[PDB]
Design a protein around this ligand. Structure first.
Ligand code: HEM
Length: 212
């Protein structure tokens, strides 16, 4: 079974629970406010920063290299623009760093530093989600908070180097299937992807609580 297929099959159930988490439900209903949005984007700032830092550390490692797409996918620079937009010039010392965010970041560094062969599970989970559900949330965000079509405040949800996200995802799935793969690695990779989803679910539950 191809890795791409193994991953989709392995995370399809937790994906359902993830997109139906309270925070995402309210978001999809359009009940998302500036406070909540700023909180989740700041958290994403930390997460992608850690993720992309580990990607750089392993860009030349064969167990990840085929998926090294900084120009097309990386979100840190975009998140930094969004942070300046929502938090101002000194967003650096203004943004929050929640426990659930720290937990996620912690795992990202363990993987990147000790289990680089599992890093693909974390890139897959975040990036392909960004190119799928994230695009739907983008429209909802714009309508709900009156964000300009010009993109300010939503740079994270914008991929200027990707013309067709659908075609890109196809490319990415096929590229995932070129990675050296053994039963041991395939099993663990799909397992780490489920973990990635859970870390996300826990972030949402934490953020939802903080808002209430
Ligand atoms: C906001 C609610 C969400 C919606 C509306 C949504 C919807 C979708 C849709 C329509 C697809 C299928 C696209 C395709 O086959 O190319 C998809 C794929 C995916 N989503 Fe979500 N999603 C949501 C939340 C999430 C979250 C929270 C994550 C994890 C951070 C996530 C990660 C993924 C991944 C990894 C894929 C690619 C699966 C694959 O083709 O292998 N999604 N999503």
């Amino acid at each position: 079974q191809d890795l791409s297929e193994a991953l989709k099959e392995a995370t399809k159930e937790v994906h359902i629970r993830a997109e139906n988490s309270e925070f995402m439900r309210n978001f999809q209903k359009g009940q998302v406010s500036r406070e909540g949005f700023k909180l989740v984007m700041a958290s994403l700032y930390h997460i992608y920063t850690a993720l992309e830092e580990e990607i750089e550390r392993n860009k030349q490692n064969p167990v990840y290299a085929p998926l090294y797409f900084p120009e097309e996918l990386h979100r840190r620079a975009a998140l930094e623009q969004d942070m300046a937009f929502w938090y101002g010039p000194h967003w650096q010392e203004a943004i929050p760093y929640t426990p659930a965010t720290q937990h996620y970041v912690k795992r990202l560094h363990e993987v990147g530093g000790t289990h680089p062969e599992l890093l693909v599970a974390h890139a897959y989970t975040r990036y392909l989600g960004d190119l799928s559900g994230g695009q739907v949330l983008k429209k909802i965000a714009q309508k709900a908070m009156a964000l300009p079509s010009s993109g300010e405040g939503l740079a994270f949800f914008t991929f200027p180097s990707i013309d067709n996200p659908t075609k890109f995802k196809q490319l990415y799935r096929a590229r995932m299937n070129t990675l050296e793969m053994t039963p041991e690695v395939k099993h663990r990779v799909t397992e780490e992807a489920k973990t990635a989803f859970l870390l996300n679910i826990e972030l949402f539950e934490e953020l939802q609580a903080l808002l209430t």
